[PDB]
Amino acid sequence: EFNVYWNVPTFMCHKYGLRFEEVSEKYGILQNWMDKFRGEEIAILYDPGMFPALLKDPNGNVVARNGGVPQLGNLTKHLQVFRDHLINQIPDKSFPGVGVIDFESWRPIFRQNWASLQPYKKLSVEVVRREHPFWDDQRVEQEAKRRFEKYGQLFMEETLKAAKRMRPAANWGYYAYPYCYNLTPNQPSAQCEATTMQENDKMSWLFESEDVLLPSVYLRWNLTSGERVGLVGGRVKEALRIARQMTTSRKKVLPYYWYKYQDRRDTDLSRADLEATLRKITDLGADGFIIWGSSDDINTKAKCLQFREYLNNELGPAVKRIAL
């Protein structure tokens, strides 16, 4: 069984008379009734609740939403807000579709908050130093990490249990987990970075409670063709690796696929890239995939028409010939 799901925000084009009915009527992609964004097939929640995060004004001041770092946050305040969004966002109690929480503020493993997620390591260390002026470096960092990791797990595990409590027939999963960081500066080959693999085995608390693993397999233009296939492949094997060790239930691997090159959004994926990467997903044995898109790529009549053309001349057909 191999299902493809549509999570492109084409509701943005309904005002111009384009309802994308062909997504499911001709290409067999699972689509929410009436092409609504959220429905009985899929629902994505972008930053729901009041997850602790570090934001920046245009002014330039750092705002610490609900603590900034997990260890400083109000869990119960996050969960009431989360439960009230969810009620409105997915009004149907029997929703049996794929439920996706898109939470990207920080990673739950302290080591993984590199590059732009660094402020989360700094801040965590600073809180401890203010508390304990006489502690030495090593003692401080150790305790910062301990704190961030305990409460990072707590915020993630508790939100997922709330989703499951509220909508018990959905298939919940966090967008982008598990990470692999292959073809990256940290891990510059098509293989996942080795410590990430050990960290993913240590994160059984997340993968055991989710129903679906959702690795992001967006391509980059600045990669050879082999590397583009290797980008997707390494990420899906890792999900599958994790998925076959789970023990509470079957786990579905449904990778998140985008039709634009991430480093070159004006360009849609080539037909050559569509076939090789969708064949990789399918040959690896995943349960299907999810096609996503930004509302900024179809936020005008002109763009909606152009996407529609690509849908019918490239993406749809590829999806129908390979995957279905």
Per DSSP, the residues of 255-281 read -EEESEETTEEEEEPPHHHHHHHHHHH
Residue with tokens 């992609």: 29
> In this structure, are residues 255 and 233 in contact, taking their beta carbons and an 8 Å threshold?
no
When divided into structural domains, the chain yields a total of 1
For 64, the domain range is: 1-324
CATH number for the domain harbouring residue 22: 3.20.20.70
Identify the DSSP state of 46.
Answer: E
Q: Is 188 helix (H, G, I), strand (E, B) or coil?
A: coil
* Cα separation, 296 vs 134, whole angstroms: 51
Resolution in A for the shown PDB structure?
A: 2.7
Question: Distance between CA atoms of 269 and 258, rounded to whole angstroms?
Answer: 8
Is 21 among the residues known to form the active site?
no
Taking the C-alpha atoms of residue 127 and residue 113, their distance in angstroms, rounded to an integer, is 17
Q: How far apart are the C-alpha atoms of 90 and 272, rounded to whole Å?
A: 37
Closest alpha carbon to 163 in 234, 114, 101: 101
Q: How far is CA 272 from the centre of its chain?
A: 25
Residues 6+ apart with CB under 8 A from 58: none
How many Å apart are CA 140 and CA 128, to the nearest integer?
A: 6
From the list 22, 40, 104, 275, the catalytic residue is 104
